[model samples]
Target chain A: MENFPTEYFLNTTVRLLEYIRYRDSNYTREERIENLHYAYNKAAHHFAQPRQQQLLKVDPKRLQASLQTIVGMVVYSWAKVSKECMADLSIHYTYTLVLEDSKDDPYPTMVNYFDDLQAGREQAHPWWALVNEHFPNVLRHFGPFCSLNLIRSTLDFFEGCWIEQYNFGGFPGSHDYPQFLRRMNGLGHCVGASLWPKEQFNERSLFLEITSAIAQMENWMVWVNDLMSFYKEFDDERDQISLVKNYVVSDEISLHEALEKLTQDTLHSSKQMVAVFSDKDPQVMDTIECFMHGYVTWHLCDRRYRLSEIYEKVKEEKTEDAQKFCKFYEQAANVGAVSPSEWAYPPVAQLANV
Target chain B: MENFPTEYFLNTTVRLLEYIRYRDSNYTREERIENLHYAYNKAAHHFAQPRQQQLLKVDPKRLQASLQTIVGMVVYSWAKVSKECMADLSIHYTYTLVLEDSKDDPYPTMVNYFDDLQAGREQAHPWWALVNEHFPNVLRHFGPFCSLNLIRSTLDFFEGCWIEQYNFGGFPGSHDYPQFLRRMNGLGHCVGASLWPKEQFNERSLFLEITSAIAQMENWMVWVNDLMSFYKEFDDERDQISLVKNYVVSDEISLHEALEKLTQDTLHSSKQMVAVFSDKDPQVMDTIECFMHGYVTWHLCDRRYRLSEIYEKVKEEKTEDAQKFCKFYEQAANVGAVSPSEWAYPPVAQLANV
Candidate 1:
């Protein structure tokens, strides 16, 4: 992870152009820079809205991870699409995601964003109009090179998250649980959208194989994040829907056992991705490898995870539950135990049955 | 339903073209006809394979409905892309789907199909190579005006059905049931793919709105089909994972109550679709409405449903289970008897509790 061209990959441009004109860019260096400035101003103006002021107020640690997710997707996808469009598209992507998080419900946030981009809907949300100013222009110019269908599908995936957030009051069973977590994080579609322009394969079947590979890779990327961020999210009370926590409760496994399973499952998912992509294309392999390692590095380095010394911090700062959680993370970091040892509670169903 | 342009809608073409040149056609009518003959020969040749001979052995009733599903998708999507491409594309679509059903597992069926389409994988699956020949030509010819991404996304949605079929052995809870059902049928992606070509709106937000609307419409379209086909499916043992059946068991509701819920939910889904699209685009509305009505009419008219009189057909059958199912269908059709009624054992949980 350390030796990889981490910065080079992260800084690559993600231009969302129309599919046909993706290769035929006419912009000068200065023109690209000027477009960047204009898009940034449009983005800056969007966050300036009084109602949308929340965009700036998100937790910096979580915000960094979210931004990392977007940047990684763009970098990975840049291997397929226009390099020049990345700088301009990056600004728009940042604004779109920031605004998406700012809303109370992402459903309306996306609807308003796309509506403002496609039509002049009424100004109930001034933020939409401000963001709409430059985003649609990017889309219009990129029409021949871009796939709005893929992008919209990405949005639909996000909308599923909101639907789950607002409507799914009950727990998804173990069978559907992993999928719920994937949809909630949405790395698959977000990361996959950038690859839409990479249609170099003469056959549709090859594309499907690689796309499936990407899907598995994206899932592993997010699952590992959930594993590393467990303590922070738990402390911040964001562990309510966390997959590891849900699995612990759902399977009634010991905390140590659950962590061990997560570790094995994560490794397996990563290998499954490589198995699919290793034969045909090296660039795709490198691109996905960068995404995988980049994601792990982000988890390890980002302040969000506090990867270096969170154990002492949690031990020093809290009550019984915090102390209990500290014990959980300590064992989780090492996957301390393998055999089913004695635990305070049995499986959830057993407890409920009793 | 009787008076609508059902025939006209069903007769339209569905061509698969390359994304860049989707609009540019170099072939004349004679050439197109010649290509069609060649593709048909390829299709005919593939089914002739000993292994693929099973592909031709699918139940005629179900096969007709499946073909109808593909045609409805093309007709519904015809407004957005090339009409000539549609005719040629239909042959490919049929081969793809027939092969999908031919296998005991659609997962490998699709994988092999795509592999053969893109690269000449092996000779065992000669059908794929045969079908692959003309499909790529259509894609190459229709590049400028086509959406390969949409078509691929459609394929992904269909693949999810296989995923569910193979992997989802346990019952999905009520929360995820509708999404699962929608993906299983794939009318949403097939129908919505057409709208990708009709990107007339300047605002992205309007497109998002209609896309969301399309999402709900597609859900309703398949959901209603589930409701209408309840009897046939149950009788045929295809109702094991039916949305209504799953909802009944998961929610602990009576069979009669679940049927009632399904009917209400189906109507609500349809109305939601109309609410989203009615004001902005009538043709879009017509396309989806035709799909909805068209699906129901097929259920009522097709031999698959045995709409002319299925009750006696079930009664005249000799099996004990057949007699029991006939009783169930008679009650289900009217959604009759909700007040603590008992014809069967009520539910699995209730029986287990006893």
Candidate 2:
């Protein structure tokens, strides 16, 4: 009943760019390449693959694509952060990706998360064990308030992920829940808090402004993702639960109308973000503007979003740096091997019964 | 489709009683009455009515019943705790009961809960404001570890409530989430952690033991609740989200089978609670045993559970003390008055759009 509806979305794309004040891309191509290179090196250094006995061989190409997409997100979104910070956040995203792929009962991990951490036990999932070990290092880089928000919001993401796994098949019978779940699942708050580093923002004196910035990010990141990823997610029922489809089922609106509603909401958030942050400290304001442009640019340029299918100028842009990023993943896949998450079909039932 | 099936439940009930070593009530009837009285006096004292101007009059009788049931839960569950502690926990339960009765869009409260807390603003609902003011007093009664669990688990309850609101109408698509949501909603950890008071248990040394106790409470209180309330909740489509009903739907089991499952689980939790705590210091073991007996007694005795209809010995037993509890509520209703939450009809739609 529905095709991609290119022209309508093209119109949306135009307005979204205008609202976000998308000038040229924020960071240079050369700079992004360097960040991507460092992010991979740092990730490999931290998550040393099992040498011989434990390497779980995966499809090398899929592993490459997944790593690229995750690291691309880190390097692109906060393009201004130092390579060290990029590595830390990159590890966070990497752990998220692994666990998100896991369809094994989340019940064990969800319940055991805090328990294992406190008791000094190995985590339920290997990735989690890695996360438990490495995450404190990540936290050390940020100030107390920012780090605490990151920790809590990361759990928010975990809680949201559990809900999503439970709610895999249908609309959750309440109109408001789709948005609620997305907020938890979005990791928007984490991104928002992460945007302000201690070196520049002076988080204590500027606490209120940072909160305003995080508040703006509440809707900014997720909505932008929903709006941009709609093109790839449109036809596939099993795709990451589209915010657009949720609106369709929850709101009982037409596909076109749902898309329009999402477009309008994301645009509104873009304006709201700028409105709140426009008069802040110059560095604070500059950080947000860079985040906005680069975040959108990553989605448009990355092969994962498939934006190149619609836009002639957008290319996968396989350069030596990206090739190096992909190659490192391949080597990691073979030796320091772990299971890559395969796309799972919707489950008829999931287990965690008391 | 199932009838009450009295004999089967009666048999299960006997085993349940034996497992917890069902004993006499913990506190004297006189002591219980005094605690109940003080609880009401404190509640009425704290939530002083907007006399002569803003009173939203509600059903005098229903308000009295709700107040009685709530205060009854506080006094009954922790009969051994001091009256002030009883009042604080009573306020916690009272606030829970008010919000639980609210079918209005919880979307606003769920998102704003943390935001408002930090910004030094009044909470969204009137009860929340009352709770904000009174809850700190409650927290002062417990050690840090216990109080922290209380706060976190209480939010877990809030988060659980919002999920229940959104998931108003279905077996959420995963078998495990029902238990997950129940953990959040049941306030089990709060009850568990609260079992060991600061006066008796030095949390720093006995942290592990306390954690084990709290973990047991996770399943103990909620499963007991589901088992006991089945008599009332069965056959009602729009009853509070029943853990038994969730088992029926999510596990695709028969009604009798669901009841049996719940009965078995509750019996197991009761045994587990004892197996872990039986070797503890005399006072610690005594406290838990008292909590278990009185908790069960409250269910058996409360008119709200309709157990009187089934058990001949179970009577409403409207004593002078009980009448006083009701009378004080009536006085609160007349002058220092506020709106009592009504039993809302199931909604067809809920609102909380992005």
Candidate 3:
């Protein structure tokens, strides 16, 4: 938490390496380092490794503890950096995206940034600088053009989705049923599933993947929007697809009207599903109910805020203070959003009448 | 094992996607897929991922037996592929490379490969191929260049060490005097511990990292000698380093002379240290012994073969049949060497006791 002490982390890394080497008494210190370098580099470069086979000689609990310690060290190293950024600032309105790739769907993947305002109306907080620094090996090793092109195009598409959601009668526009047609973005698709692993755990563990996921998701969402035209000199379909119809857009009113109708339909459908599943599992039933209510209220009161305090300041102040603030904001953001205890919802099956 | 039922692996992958989606219930199926697709593609290209957050989740085993079931299928698949390759008539000899990289080495990574004639070795078996196929994502997504490089380099070094010993005055080049320069390779470096992880089991589940290490080690020792050096043409350094000279190499002698030296040194100094505390812990003792022998033999052989398999096949094998064979061979070569049984000599802790 203390800004993820680098020296501490590195020290621990060295210790862990030594532990693994000496624990078995099979490898000399020098040999262990070489192996570590190889595995570490390969992992950094996106190599799918042949799984590590451990010697089953260590105490079960201790072994798990040790391995987890090392695993956590590796997984959390970069993420911790971002979270500390958020904490240094006071903004708390940032959000993360959730995604799924349906097997049967030939359509491109779908991404949704969660929002408290719309209950289920997702929010996005994507970033760009991050994808490069951490993944230099992949980029440097793979070469620039292909890697950059892939990253840019995909991020643009995701932002496009968010903008579409935001502009489709998201704010200021009066609702109308016929507006549904305007809401239709080219090539729409979605996947369905019953549970997520993070959700299955208590709030503590759930926070692990969630914080990081949100951090990654936020940056991705923002990049997509940028690709669609936020900072671009001119918005063009070829360069990036704009999600929301804006001043430069040709058919803004019509699209907004269509989105209003579509949003209503989606809300209505969601409510219907919640009611249907309400009795199947108490935990899930409660979750659906909460989600439904939040969904409704969020639409009625559309509030947008940077999930991180730093972004909020940067957006407002636009000064060098933003740098230090943003760094801290990123770190805090990495800490991730904490769930409210009272609104807590159990997993779907847990509430089911077994 | 049926040469990696691609259809089956893909199906399981889809299921994984579904599982991840459900875990983040807040997002719609469409949003989830979009996000997942972007991230998945990025990960595939080895794009730098945003920092990872500390995520705690349910024990993977606790999830539907379906997850484990699929894992079993993959392992089974690997076994099947390995078995089939062994049965093939065209594969005359299999060269295995056991490369252990530890975390504490100061030396630059050295990957060497040579044929070790009289060491403990295993053949590429049925189980190994499935393992390779099961983890094809590593190679396919990461690019084949890096993974092959690791295998070839690792094996080559180990093989080189063995050859050196065979050529020198005595096997193991039994050194009574501690001479740093005497043992150092051209790079003025020596092999160290091949740090291997010990198995971990927690209140909720067990991890397989240790077993994986064992599998890889076993695969390397057995097939290293048989690895044809056809790929050596690709490397200028390899070309120079592989020259055989009697006086220059340690343990330089005929196989008989090498064996005689091994007998003398081993009798005088090859003693093992047994821990009384481990008497009650068979698993710990066994693993310790495995590392003991595995480490010694690996060093004695001193070869690097991580990427040599690729060098050999990619350089010479142009025909479809030959390429397929090379792929199969490479797959077999990746598995680690097996732990030497307790019955095998040096009786754990030989060097330390001596």
Which candidate achieves the best lDDT against the true structure? Answer: 2
**Model 2 / residue B41 / CA error / Å:** 14
Top TM-score hit: 2
Give the alpha carbon lDDT tens digit for every residue of A1-354 in model 3.
Answer: 113222222232223222212111122334323332333333322211111112112233332233222222222222111222212110111001211111122111121211111122212222221222233322222211122222322333333333333222221211111121121122111000111121232323232222222212222222222221222312234322233333123233654343343333333333334333434445433433332222222211111222232245354554444443344334323332222121112221223212
Model 2 per-residue lDDT tens digits across residues A169-216: 223222443565576578765788888777666766676556556656
Say what the RMSD of model 2 is.
Answer: 18.8
Residue B349: error of model 1 in Å?
A: 52
The interface RMSD value for candidate 2 stands at 16.4
Fill in the DockQ of model 3: 0.01
- Error (Å) of candidate 1 at residue A227 is 2.7
Global local distance difference test of model 1: 0.41
- Residue B159's lDDT within candidate 1 is 47
In model 1, where do residues sit more than 4 Å from their true spots?
Answer: A1-93, A96-146, A157-178, A196-206, A245-268, A310-354, B1-320, B329-354
Q: What TM-score results for chain B when candidate 2 is compared with the true chain B?
A: 0.81
Query: What value does the lDDT take at residue A22 in candidate 2?
Result: 66
**DockQ for each model:** 0.03, 0.02, 0.01
DockQ winner between candidates 1 and 3: 1
Candidate order, TM-score descending: 2, 1, 3
Q: lDDT per residue, candidate 2, B1-354, as tens digits?
A: 657876566556656767877655435665666677777666544434443012213333444465567777777778677888887787677667655655555444434443344345666655556655566677767775576567556765664565565543233222433464576578876788777667767875665456556656667788887877878876576774577776666557777787788887787777767766787767777777877776777776666676646554222335443343234323322321221221111110111010
